[PDB]
C-alpha cells in the first residue's frame with residue numbers, strides 16, 4: 143500500500159490503481175512455504191484486511207492485489223475470498239503460483255511473451271494469445287509485469303500492443319517499471335553519482351538489477 | 354422391364370449448388386433386395402464405456418416389420434475374427450416409454466465387452482456384429498450385419514476427444530470425381546485415394562458436400 147496521498151492524486155488526476163498488499167516471500171523455498179502455512183495466515187490477513195479498510199473509498203482503486211511473488215498457498219485462497227465477500231465492487235488479482243490460480247479473477251502473468259511459450263514446470267508462462275484459449279479458460283488477461291525496461295530495453299514493445307489491440311480479452315499490462323532505483327552518492331569533490339547494488343558495501347547484493 | 358425417367362433439373366437442384374461439375378443420370382449402383390415378410394427393418398449400434406475404456410457395453414436396438422409373434426427373437430452376436438466375444442437373445446417388446454406403452458416391434462440387446470479393442474484411424478480395430486431374426490426354437494428368418502468399431506467421440510472442456518484423447522485432424526475434402534467416368538465411383542479409385550491419403554499422413558476426410 144502506498145503513501146495515502148498517492149490515491150488522492152490518482153483520484154483527481156485520473157489513473158486506474160491496483161492496490162497491493164505488502165506480502166512478498168520470494169526468497170522462501172518453495173515460494174509458498176509461508177503462504178500455505180496456516181500459522182502465517184494471521185500476519186498475512188492483516189496486510190490484506192487493513193489495506194482494504196484504509197483504501198476502499200478511493201475511486202482510483204479498481205483492483206485489489208494479494209501481494210507479489212509468494213507462490214500460491216491456501217492463505218491466498220482464504221484472503222481472496224475475504225475480499226470478494228467484503229468488497230464485491232472490485233476484482234481481486236494475484237500472480238503467484240502460475241498466474242491463473244483460484245486466487246485470481248484476472249490472468250496476470252509477469253513476462254509471458256506474445257507468441258512464444260515458456261513451458262516451465264508447474265508455473266509455465268504461456269504465450270498470452272494461447273493462454274486465453276486454454277481448455278476451460280474464460281478470464282481476461284492483464285500482465286502484472288511485462289516489457290522489462292532494464293537499461294537499453296523495450297525491444298518488442300510494439301508486439302504486445304498489436305496483440306492487445308487485436309484480442310478483446312488481452313486487456314493490457316503494467317510495464318516493469320517506472321523509475322530506476324539508483325541512489326545518489328558523492329565523490330571526494332562532492333560531485334553526485336548514481337549508485338546501485340553493492341555500492342554501499344552491501345553484500346551479498348544484486349548489482350544493477352534494481353534499475 | 355424397368356423404365357426410369359431421370360430429370361436433370363428439379364426443385365432438388367436448389368439444394369444441390371455445390372462447386373463442382375453439374376451432371377445427371379443413374380450414377381450409382383442399382384440393385385434388387387429380397388427380404389422376408391417378417392424382417393429386420395432397422396438396427397442401431399451404440400458403444401458406451403467406463404472412465405478408462407477397459408469396459409464397454411454394446412447396445413443394439415433392432416426393429417421389425419411384419420406380424421408380431423411371441424416366438425420371435427433377436428440374437429445379436431459379437432465376433433472378433435473367428436471368436437464370438439459376446440451374445441444376447443431377447444423377444445420383441447421394448448421398455449415402457451409413455452402412457453400408451455412401448456414399442457412391441459422393437460428390442461434392445463445389451464452386450465458386455467471386457468477390454469474392448471478400440472477403433473481409431475491409428476489402429477482400426479473392428480468387430481463383426483451379426484443381427485439374427487429368428488424363432489425361439491432355432492429357425493433363422495434372416496440375418497443382417499455390420500462392422501463395429503468401439504470408440505467414443507465427445508467434446509469436453511472445449512476439446513474434441515476420441516477415446517479420451519484430443520484429436521489432431523489431418524484432413525482433406527474429397528469429392529467423388531473421376532476424369533473419365535465423372536461422378537461415378539468405383540472400388541479401385543476409392544482404395545487408390547485412401548492409400549494415397551494415408552501414405553501422405555492424412556487421418557480424416559470430409560464428404561464434400563453430400
Ligand SMILES: *[C@@H]1C[C@@H](O)[C@@H](O)[C@@H](CO)O1
Nearest residue numbers: 370371372373526561562
Ligand atoms: C469451400 C466450398 C467448396 O465447395 C469450394 O467452393 C471451395 C473453394 O474452391 O470453398
Ligand SMILES: [Mg+2]
Nearest residue numbers: 370371372373
Ligand atoms: Mg459453394
Ligand code: NA
Nearest residue numbers: 306309310312
Ligand atoms: Na484487447
Ligand code: NA
Nearest residue numbers: 350351352353
Ligand atoms: Na528488479
